[PDB]
Design an enzyme around this catalytic site. Structure first.
Site, PDB file in Angstrom:
ATOM      1  N   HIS A  40       2.684 -60.413  23.166  1.00 39.20           N
ATOM      2  CA  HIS A  40       2.749 -59.281  24.272  1.00 39.20           C
ATOM      3  C   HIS A  40       1.265 -59.426  24.608  1.00 39.20           C
ATOM      4  O   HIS A  40       1.012 -58.934  25.906  1.00 39.20           O
ATOM      5  CB  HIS A  40       3.429 -58.083  24.128  1.00 39.20           C
ATOM      6  CG  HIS A  40       2.687 -57.001  23.702  1.00 39.20           C
ATOM      7  ND1 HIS A  40       2.726 -56.541  22.261  1.00 39.20           N
ATOM      8  CD2 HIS A  40       1.518 -56.123  24.316  1.00 39.20           C
ATOM      9  CE1 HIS A  40       2.007 -55.482  22.198  1.00 39.20           C
ATOM     10  NE2 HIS A  40       1.283 -55.371  23.131  1.00 39.20           N
ATOM     11  N   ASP A  84       6.970 -60.354  17.771  1.00 42.19           N
ATOM     12  CA  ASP A  84       5.756 -60.043  18.718  1.00 42.19           C
ATOM     13  C   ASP A  84       4.408 -60.495  17.820  1.00 42.19           C
ATOM     14  O   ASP A  84       3.812 -59.763  17.437  1.00 42.19           O
ATOM     15  CB  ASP A  84       5.865 -58.657  19.039  1.00 42.19           C
ATOM     16  CG  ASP A  84       4.812 -58.332  19.849  1.00 42.19           C
ATOM     17  OD1 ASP A  84       4.079 -59.193  20.640  1.00 42.19           O
ATOM     18  OD2 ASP A  84       4.528 -57.213  20.221  1.00 42.19           O
ATOM     19  N   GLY A 175      -3.865 -50.348  24.478  1.00 39.57           N
ATOM     20  CA  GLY A 175      -5.155 -51.099  24.132  1.00 39.57           C
ATOM     21  C   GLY A 175      -5.420 -51.418  22.712  1.00 39.57           C
ATOM     22  O   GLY A 175      -6.078 -52.209  22.385  1.00 39.57           O
ATOM     23  N   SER A 177      -2.791 -52.727  21.058  1.00 43.89           N
ATOM     24  CA  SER A 177      -1.999 -53.804  21.315  1.00 43.89           C
ATOM     25  C   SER A 177      -2.811 -55.008  20.405  1.00 43.89           C
ATOM     26  O   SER A 177      -3.733 -55.377  20.790  1.00 43.89           O
ATOM     27  CB  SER A 177      -1.461 -54.301  22.486  1.00 43.89           C
ATOM     28  OG  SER A 177      -0.592 -53.506  23.102  1.00 43.89           O
ATOM     29  N   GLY A 178      -1.959 -55.595  19.595  1.00 41.35           N
ATOM     30  CA  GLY A 178      -2.548 -56.819  19.070  1.00 41.35           C
ATOM     31  C   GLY A 178      -3.286 -56.768  17.754  1.00 41.35           C
ATOM     32  O   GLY A 178      -3.529 -57.615  17.028  1.00 41.35           O
TER      33      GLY A 178
HETATM   34  C1  LIG Z   1       2.881 -45.398  25.289  1.00 44.90           C
HETATM   35  O1  LIG Z   1       2.409 -46.255  26.004  1.00 44.90           O
HETATM   36  C2  LIG Z   1       1.880 -47.360  25.272  1.00 44.90           C
HETATM   37  C3  LIG Z   1       1.290 -48.467  26.077  1.00 44.90           C
HETATM   38  C4  LIG Z   1       0.840 -49.569  25.472  1.00 44.90           C
HETATM   39  C5  LIG Z   1       1.354 -49.942  24.036  1.00 44.90           C
HETATM   40  N1  LIG Z   1       0.964 -50.794  23.233  1.00 44.90           N
HETATM   41  C6  LIG Z   1       1.456 -50.517  21.972  1.00 44.90           C
HETATM   42  C7  LIG Z   1       1.999 -49.285  22.008  1.00 44.90           C
HETATM   43  C8  LIG Z   1       2.395 -48.404  20.844  1.00 44.90           C
HETATM   44  C9  LIG Z   1       1.249 -47.672  19.976  1.00 44.90           C
HETATM   45  N2  LIG Z   1       2.109 -47.082  18.863  1.00 44.90           N
HETATM   46  C10 LIG Z   1       1.728 -48.764  23.445  1.00 44.90           C
HETATM   47  C11 LIG Z   1       2.362 -47.509  23.714  1.00 44.90           C
HETATM   48  C1  LIG Z   2       1.542 -54.233  26.861  1.00 47.17           C
HETATM   49  O1  LIG Z   2       0.119 -54.302  27.358  1.00 47.17           O
HETATM   50  C2  LIG Z   2      -0.477 -55.610  27.656  1.00 47.17           C
HETATM   51  C3  LIG Z   2      -1.884 -55.309  27.472  1.00 47.17           C
HETATM   52  C4  LIG Z   2      -2.476 -56.503  27.577  1.00 47.17           C
HETATM   53  C5  LIG Z   2      -1.846 -57.768  27.945  1.00 47.17           C
HETATM   54  N1  LIG Z   2      -2.444 -59.006  28.274  1.00 47.17           N
HETATM   55  C6  LIG Z   2      -1.438 -59.929  28.481  1.00 47.17           C
HETATM   56  C7  LIG Z   2      -0.033 -59.279  28.419  1.00 47.17           C
HETATM   57  C8  LIG Z   2       1.179 -59.607  28.731  1.00 47.17           C
HETATM   58  C9  LIG Z   2       1.543 -60.807  27.722  1.00 47.17           C
HETATM   59  N2  LIG Z   2       2.222 -62.115  28.567  1.00 47.17           N
HETATM   60  C10 LIG Z   2      -0.357 -57.820  28.186  1.00 47.17           C
HETATM   61  C11 LIG Z   2       0.246 -56.608  28.086  1.00 47.17           C
END
Ligand SMILES: COc1ccc2[nH]cc(CCN)c2c1
Ligand SMILES: COc1ccc2[nH]cc(CCN)c2c1
Ligand SMILES: [Ca+2]
Length: 223
Positions: A40, A84, A175, A177-178
């Site tokens: 993602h 993911d 943020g 994420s990943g």
């Molecule tokens: C509640 O909003 C978000 C927004 C982006 C996110 N990315 C990953 C997670 C889960 C973290 N445990 C997350 C949560």
């Molecule tokens: C869940 O938050 C995010 C944060 C950063 C991101 N960059 C690219 C994507 C979408 C992937 N195609 C993304 C999503």
């Protein structure tokens, strides 16, 4: 990271920041040429930033290397977040040192109860928004599959696990994420999703890296 602590500069030497004009995701360095992140997090124009602590200040240990290729898992489903995971190849090899170092892949899956380290530059508030400059850390246990599925009916696949605290207050967040979940020196998880952050009965959900080691190795071997 909500409810964590300041890691300390370069104490998580496999942690990378993915930058497209700004930090947008974490990732983990797995060899001199390759980073693992969440599918993602896919987008074009990624610069991988290694050796970071303060992402807004050049402190002297960074390596900035553009991606040459990104490979999202063939079976990634962006609606369910099943599978993911994504690999990113660097245009040039990172210079490995004490502050820029790869993290080992698992040889077996980790068990509920194992203590892990989760890290990133994501939001530090569970209600509200505040984004840190320096890397944040959280020690958290893997939760049982049964408690994970009970927390998220209909949503936990065999490629996901929960980690954190059912009482709330401590979690990864937007943020992060990943980024990595490292347990006993192995990359067992990738920050994937959750319902909010640090909410009661809603622990973080993570990609189960051990299911992907064969794909990672064969992808690296031919790319
Ligand atoms: C509640 O909003 C978000 C927004 C982006 C996110 N990315 C990953 C997670 C889960 C973290 N445990 C997350 C949560
Ligand atoms: C869940 O938050 C995010 C944060 C950063 C991101 N960059 C690219 C994507 C979408 C992937 N195609 C993304 C999503
Ligand atoms: Ca920096």
């Amino acid at each position: 990271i909500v409810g964590g602590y300041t890691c300390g500069a370069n104490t998580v030497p496999y942690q990378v920041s993915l930058n497209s004009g700004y930090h947008f995701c974490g990732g983990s360095l797995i060899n001199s040429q390759w980073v693992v992140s969440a599918a993602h997090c896919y987008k074009s124009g990624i610069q991988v930033r290694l050796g970071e602590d303060n992402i807004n200040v050049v402190e002297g240990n960074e390596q900035f290397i553009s991606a040459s290729k990104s490979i999202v898992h063939p079976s990634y489903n962006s609606n369910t977040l099943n599978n993911d995971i994504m690999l990113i190849k660097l245009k040039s090899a990172a210079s490995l040192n004490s502050r820029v170092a790869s993290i080992s892949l698992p040889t077996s899956c980790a068990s509920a109860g194992t203590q892990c380290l989760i890290s990133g530059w994501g939001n530090t508030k569970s209600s509200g928004t505040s984004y840190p400059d320096v890397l944040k850390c959280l020690k958290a246990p893997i939760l049982s599959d049964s408690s994970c599925k009970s927390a998220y009916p209909g949503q936990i696949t065999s490629n996901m696990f929960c980690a954190g605290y059912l009482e709330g207050g401590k979690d990864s967040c937007q943020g992060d994420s990943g980024g990595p979940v490292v347990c006993s020196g192995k990359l067992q998880g990738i920050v994937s999703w959750g319902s909010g952050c640090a909410q009661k009965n809603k622990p973080g959900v993570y990609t189960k890296v051990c299911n992907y080691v064969s794909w990672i190795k064969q992808t690296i071997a031919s790319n």
